[PDB]
Design a protein around this nucleic acid. Sequence first.
RNA 1: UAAGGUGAUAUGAACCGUUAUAACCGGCGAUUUCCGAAUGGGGAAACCCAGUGUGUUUCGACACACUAUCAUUAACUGAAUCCAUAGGUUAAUGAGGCGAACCGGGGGAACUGAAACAUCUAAGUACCCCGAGGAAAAGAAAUCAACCGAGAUUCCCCCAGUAGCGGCGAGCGAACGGGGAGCAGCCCAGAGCCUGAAUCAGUGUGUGUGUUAGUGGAAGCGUCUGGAAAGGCGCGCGAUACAGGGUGACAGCCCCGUACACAAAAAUGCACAUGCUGUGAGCUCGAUGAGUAGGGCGGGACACGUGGUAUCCUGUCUGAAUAUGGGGGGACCAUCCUCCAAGGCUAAAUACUCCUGACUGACCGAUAGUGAACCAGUACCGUGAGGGAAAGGCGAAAAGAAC
Lengths: 77, 61, 50, 46, 102, 101
Amino acid sequence: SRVCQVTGKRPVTGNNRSHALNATKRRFLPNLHSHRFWVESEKRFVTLRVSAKGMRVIDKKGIDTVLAELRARGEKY
Amino acid sequence: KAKELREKSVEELNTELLNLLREQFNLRMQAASGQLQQSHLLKQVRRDVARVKTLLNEKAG
Amino acid sequence: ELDENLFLAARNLHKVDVRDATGIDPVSLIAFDKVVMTADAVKQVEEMLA
Amino acid sequence: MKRTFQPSVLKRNRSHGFRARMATKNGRQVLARRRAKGRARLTVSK
Amino acid sequence: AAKIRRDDEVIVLTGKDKGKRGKVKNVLSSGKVIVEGINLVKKHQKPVPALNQPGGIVEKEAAIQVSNVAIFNAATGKADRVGFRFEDGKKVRFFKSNSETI
Amino acid sequence: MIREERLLKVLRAPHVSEKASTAMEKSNTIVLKVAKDATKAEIKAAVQKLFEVEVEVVNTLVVKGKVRQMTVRSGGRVIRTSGRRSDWKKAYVTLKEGQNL
RNA sequence: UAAGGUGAUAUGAACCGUUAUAACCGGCGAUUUCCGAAUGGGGAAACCCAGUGUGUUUCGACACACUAUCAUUAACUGAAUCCAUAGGUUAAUGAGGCGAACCGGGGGAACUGAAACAUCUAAGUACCCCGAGGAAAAGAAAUCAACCGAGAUUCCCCCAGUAGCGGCGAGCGAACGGGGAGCAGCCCAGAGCCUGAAUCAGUGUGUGUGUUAGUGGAAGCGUCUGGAAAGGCGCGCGAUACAGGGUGACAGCCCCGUACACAAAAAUGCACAUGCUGUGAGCUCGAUGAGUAGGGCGGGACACGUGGUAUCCUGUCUGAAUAUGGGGGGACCAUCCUCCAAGGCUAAAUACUCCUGACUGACCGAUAGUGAACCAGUACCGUGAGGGAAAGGCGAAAAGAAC
């Protein structure tokens, strides 16, 4: 489902508010993208389904440590 | 009745069970055929079969 | 003071109740035909009712 | 004339039988409700 | 713990048989007893020709409640109660009012 | 090699029923009630070993139990109850030339 | 524990037993068909069809065991492709499904009210889904206060229908502070000295106390009426027992009990006391949770509907400082007060009752009380989900009516 594999971002729910303040009910979707990350340590590409925030997190932390966290949670990549 | 079946081995317990089952079969035939006014040996033979099998389970474990 | 001996001796009697002088209640004083109070019980009820 | 109940055992079992009830969580909920009520005959599977 | 057994000479306390004495024959699980020649009733026995005498007006004793009979002392010549005590590690009944083992 | 206990359980009772007497006296077949889970091989072996006869063939049918209803005075009231008789299995056993009962 | 039993229907038949191995009651155990998570494959529940082993055989066959999926771990072997991964096989653990309410979380109405209706209300209710426990959640200050101070969570009573919010309408509705119930606080982000150093979970013993069968239990007779006495009348007795129930009408003394005093082969609960097993203490130095706080845009939560809007959460885009630093004090700024986020754990007071025991009722008494006093979630109705009744009383005793 539309869940970021790094940050655990999910679709959330909220309201469309009009000018007359009619509250229709909607979803906020995370900015999910499938990307191929080169893992220098073990020499291959891992495809992850991450948001843009997730990609910023990856290139701050590093792909290897994020992969370590993913393995800690039992996520499969 | 269990007291003096408890100190037999395992094979003559088996022969005892076979004799009891044979007696049960002839008793069933008599009851069906109209003989066997002693309509109480049926309960007896079945309780003894149960007793022998209980003892057999006990010795084999 | 609630003498346990008296309480035990009374609690299979018929019309007889034994109190503590802090357990007296409006209905009990009216219900029974006679009320016996020990003198110290009178003193306690005196100070209690002020 | 022709009426609405046209019996057929195969269709009866395939539509309302025990295994059809157990296939989905909604049918299993039906079975749980019928157990809670104390129904003697749980399904049409008689 | 039964307080009335197979053959106790009992005396009836109530029920149109007061003072009549008898021997218990049966003790029923419903707390009733059959005693010798006490609660006679007139059964109207159906013929039933199947292995049975036709039967007319049969006289037979009916069950009576154990609360209605009392063990007979036969030494004091009166009805009395029964207590339980232990002697030789054995539970025994004794007469009250004279404390003699039954 | 069906074991002894199986054989001692399969044969339940001889079935006297006129059609059975005629079968015995005409076709040399006995008719008997068997355990509802008995197979033809089991009945063959059981009859052969327990009656010491030699059998030709076994035919089996399953009798479906009727419904009888009657009353029960449980609770003082005579409640009308109905239920199904038990299904049973009938075996037509053709002996060759012997005779047992 | 026992003089009686083989459940009701139940009569009968054939039997078992009488100090002790009859029955009955309790602890432990054995057996425990088939379906059902159903798990060897399948299936239209309670059925059909197997594979591999081990053993048996009268050579027809037979008996038993194992064989689901997923997760984790291990061993073996292993593609594109050299290494290597993916994959494959086999093991070992664990899960699965059901259940009344209570609990946390993910989603989430409308009728209705506003005397119409759209903001608002109803309402984060009903309902759907996930997860857990005997409770859950929360929890050890980036908390309040006010220049005085308090000192983690939770729950109750006030504050108070107040201050506020609000088509300022309908309506919503606090905190501060006070009184109570309950109450101990601790770890990691790391090294040395001591270095099992008390502590907490598990296990093995012993003691105590419960639970699961039980034991003893006190005292009344005359007479009248009556079918029958427990009632009337008379004279007695017990009471740490006059709770209650039964018995031919209303019984302290007829029965079962009750007060009271005792009881456990065995299995278990809770306390202790120890034995052992893993953890672990204390001191000195250190370190102090970054795509985070904050911001822009859109929403949501805060009593607070964007308003002059503090604070919290985040879908999106960004983005610090580092204890000479940072958060909060209801726009914002300066002073001075207070506290230290971005890591965790934590009993009690609190919520509920499918179920078990005891006890109670100015609760009902057969059109009432559960739908169901009764063989009722039955009969019957409906394809189905589902709906869903009516129906108690002879008599003290069947003595239930021979002829």
